[PDB]
Every structure is written in C-alpha cells, then in structure tokens.
Structure 1
Amino acid sequence: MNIFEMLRIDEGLRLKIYKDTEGYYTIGIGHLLTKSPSLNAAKSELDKAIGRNTNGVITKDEAEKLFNQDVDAAVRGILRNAKLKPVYDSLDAVRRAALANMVFQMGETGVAGFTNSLRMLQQKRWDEAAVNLAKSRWYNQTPNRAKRVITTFRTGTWDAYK
C-alpha cells in the first residue's frame, strides 16, 4: 500500500466531469477543477489542465497524469508549509501518507487549521489525536473516509485500507 493506492481508494476514478461531495466540478482521481457553479468554467479549466479540447472527457492516462501532479503538489505543499512541515517530519511513513491524504482532500490551508490535532500528532498522542480529529466538519461530512484516515493515524498501519 502507498499514498497513490490509498488516495485511489478514497477518491475513485471518473473519466467524465462529475461533482464532488461538496458539489464542485471534478475529474479523474479527485482533481478539483473549479468551485464555480459553471460547467463551462469547469470545461475550460479541464482543457487548460490537459492541453487539449476534451469536451469534458479524459482518458485513463490523462487522469493518472493529473493524479501524479496533484500528489506531488500535495506533499511539496506540506514541506513548504511552516505549520505542517514539522508535523510531517516527525511522523513515520504510514502516518505521513495519512497527513498527505488530508492535504490532498482539503488543502494545506484547511489542514493547517487542525492546530490542536497537529500538536497531538507531533507529540505522538495517537488516541488523543484521533478523538480530536473526529470533532470536525470533515469527519461529519465524509465519515467513512475520515474514519479510514483517522485509524491510520491511530495505528500506524494500513489496516483500514485492507
């Protein structure tokens, strides 16, 4: 198991523009296109992202390319974030993947806001962090996914994905 497979499980794969859990236009493996309510706007961002006239549809290869880019950007963003980097550096490899999963879903800004949980993770207070992570909009909106990521931080294994 690894960050790629983990996210591929959590995000799924769709070759046509679709709307995410929040109602935003998305494509591939969780690649957010825009928050704009306009499908046209989405179509435009997609073509810009792919480099061609897609007409709202992409191939598997194309989706995978966006995916590789987004994972890289996600991790690199953590390293560039002063509040996240320390946390991430303190963690073991499995747990790093958990943090990166959160960043991928909610943005660096959103995760940096989990101040108290970050502190607990940094202190390796696993059970405590898990409880605090659950007190959030994130957990209430996407509970199954949130549970998977939380268990990963709690146990340090890939069990929830197994």
Structure 2
Amino acid sequence: MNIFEMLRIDEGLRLKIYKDTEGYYTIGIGHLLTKSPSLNAAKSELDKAIGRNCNGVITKDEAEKLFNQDVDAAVRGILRNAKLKPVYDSLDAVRRCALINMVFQMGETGVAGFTNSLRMLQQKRWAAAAAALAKSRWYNQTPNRAKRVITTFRTGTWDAYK
C-alpha cells in the first residue's frame, strides 16, 4: 500500500466536474477546482489546468497527471512548513502517509492548525493524538475517511485500508 493507492481510495476517480463534499467544484482524484459557485469559473479553471478546452470533462491520464502534481505539492508544502516539517521528520513511514493524506485534503494551513494533535504526534502519544483529531469539524464532515486517517496515525499500520 502506498500514498497514491491510499488517496485513490479516499477520494475516488471522477472524470467530469463535480461538487465535492462542500459545494466545491472538483474533478479527478480530489483536485479542487474552485470555491466559487460558478460552474463557469470551475469550467474555466479546468481549462487552464489541463491546458485545453476540456468542456468540464477530463481523461484518466489527465486526472493522473493532476494527482501526481497534487501529491508532490503536498509533500513539498509539508517540507517547507515550519510547523509541519518537524512533525513529519519525527514520524515512521506509515504515519507520514497519514500526514500527507490530511495536507492533500485540507491544505497546509488547515493541518497546521491541529496544534495540539501535532504536538501529541511529535511526542508519540498516539492514543491521545487520535482523540484530539476526532474533535474537529473534519471528523464530523467526513467521518469515515477521517477515521481511516486517524486509525492510521494511531496504529502505524495500513489496516484501515486493507
């Protein structure tokens, strides 16, 4: 199991525009297009990203290209982040995937605000970290996903995805 497989399970693959779980226009494997309510903006956002006139529909290969860039963007953001780096450096390989998962989903800034959870993870207080993470809007909005990520952090294994 790896990060890509891990995220493909959590996000799915959709080749046509879509509203995410919060109104948002998205496509591919969790590629946020826009927070604006304009299909039009999303539609335009899609074209600028693919580089072509997509008319709100993309191909697998295209969705995969976008996914490759997003994961890279996620890892590099963590590594540039004064808040996230130390946490990341301190973790084993599995749990690191979990951190990447979260950043992909909510942005650097979003994850950076899980102060307490972050401190706990750095201290290797797994169980405590899992409880803090659970008390979030994230958990209540996308509970099943959230739980897969939290178990991953708690256990250090890929069980939740097996």
Q: TM-score range by the shorter chain?
A: over 0.9
Q: Deviations over 1:61-103 (max 9, x none)?
A: 0000000000000010000110000000000100000000000
How many aligned residue pairs are there? 162
The aligned residue for residue 91 of structure 1 is 91
Separation of aligned partners in 1, 2:2 and 2:153: 14
Separation of aligned partners in 1, 2:136 and 2:57: 34
Which consecutive residues of structure 2, in runs of 5 or more, have no partner in the other structure? none
Deviation at 1:134, TM superposition (A): 0.2
Deviation at 1:29, TM superposition (A): 0.2
Deviation at 1:26, TM superposition (A): 0.1
SS of 1:27's partner is: strand
RMSD across aligned positions (CA): 0.3
Deviation at 1:156, TM superposition (A): 0.1
Instruction: Provide the TM-score with structure 1 as the length reference.
Output: 0.99
Deviation at 1:153, TM superposition (A): 0.1
The aligned residue for residue 81 of structure 1 is 81
Separation of aligned partners in 1, 2:134 and 2:60: 34
Q: Deviations over 1:22-68 (max 9, x none)?
A: 11000000000000100000010100000100000000000000000
The aligned residue for residue 55 of structure 1 is 55
Which consecutive residues of structure 1, in runs of 5 or more, have no partner in the other structure? none
Deviation at 1:147, TM superposition (A): 0.2
Q: Which portions of structure 1, spanning 4 or more consecutive aligned residues, are displaced by more than 4 angstroms?
A: none
SS of 2:36's partner is: coil
Separation of aligned partners in 2, 1:104 and 1:148: 15
SS of 1:22's partner is: coil
Deviation at 1:128, TM superposition (A): 0.4
Deviation at 1:154, TM superposition (A): 0.3
